[PDB]
């Protein structure tokens, strides 16, 4: 395995851990805030993904400091990951156009 491919793999593993830990902690931050809805694990899990993907429907979102601090980590994980895959694909493609020119 080439590095770009390892780091994407690493980032996909690490993204999943962030999505799960994120779900757990979002519920743990958000319970105790009256009106908070991000307060059960299953939909937390859905929230974490709609967050890391930057889709962000807003059906759900945090309203407490630590919710928001957890949310900011999920986003960054999301964006970094979905930009290391791109960087990896860009390096795979560049490699293949180098061979198709003889280099």
């Amino acid at each position, epitope marked *: 395995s080439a590095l770009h491919w390892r780091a994407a793999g690493a980032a996909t593993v690490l993204l999943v851990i962030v999505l799960l830990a994120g779900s757990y902690l979002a519920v*743990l931050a958000e319970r105790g*805030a009256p*009106g*908070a809805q991000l*307060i*059960t*694990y*299953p939909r937390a899990l859905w929230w974490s993904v709609v967050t890391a993907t930057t889709v962000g429907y807003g059906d759900l979102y945090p309203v407490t400091l630590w919710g928001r601090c957890v949310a900011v980590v999920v986003m960054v994980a999301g964006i970094t990951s979905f930009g290391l895959v791109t960087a990896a694909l860009a390096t795979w493609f560049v490699g293949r156009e180098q061979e198709r020119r003889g280099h």
Partner: antibody
Amino acid sequence: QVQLQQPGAELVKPGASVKLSCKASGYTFTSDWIHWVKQRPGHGLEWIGEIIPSYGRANYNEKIQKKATLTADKSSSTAFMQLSSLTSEDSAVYYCARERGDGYFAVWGAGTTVTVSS
Amino acid sequence: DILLTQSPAILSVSPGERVSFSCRASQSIGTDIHWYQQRTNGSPRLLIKYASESISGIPSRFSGSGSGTDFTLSINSVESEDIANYYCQQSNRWPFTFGSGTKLEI
């Protein structure tokens, strides 16, 4: 196998305090919340508070006076609720109940009848 | 804090007849309503979760229905064992809240 095990009764002198136990058997998870629910005679169910024994965080009913303080013993699988400086208002049955963090109370204890008198 | 309203408080029905209990949320809670039975001197017992879903253990005689603000627990053909106090309970917004309850009476 009875999952939530609670004392039948505690007598308490007005002004005094009391620690209610709730020993849990069956599947435990990290995810699990223990809840406490107050029922005065001929009245209905009131949500007091919740604790997650794994991380030890608890939350309580703002909407009522904050008599209670919640604790767990990770090792002995027990939740405690500490009701302090009681009066006859506080004379009720206190149920504990297990919620998997998915919103419903799947299982309840038999509750503890707490009587505040001299 | 979401307000659960159970009218009527008492429900008089005849043996084997269909009965329905109403639970109205002060604001849309989706399907995040749960129904409990409490007989005299008993602890509460989950009948229905997320408005409609059966609990295994519970007679098929029991159903729920509803979305948003209007919810309904129904018993097709009531019998004596059904005599108890019914409560609804929301999980949609912190903190969880309970209905004031309704007495089934044959």
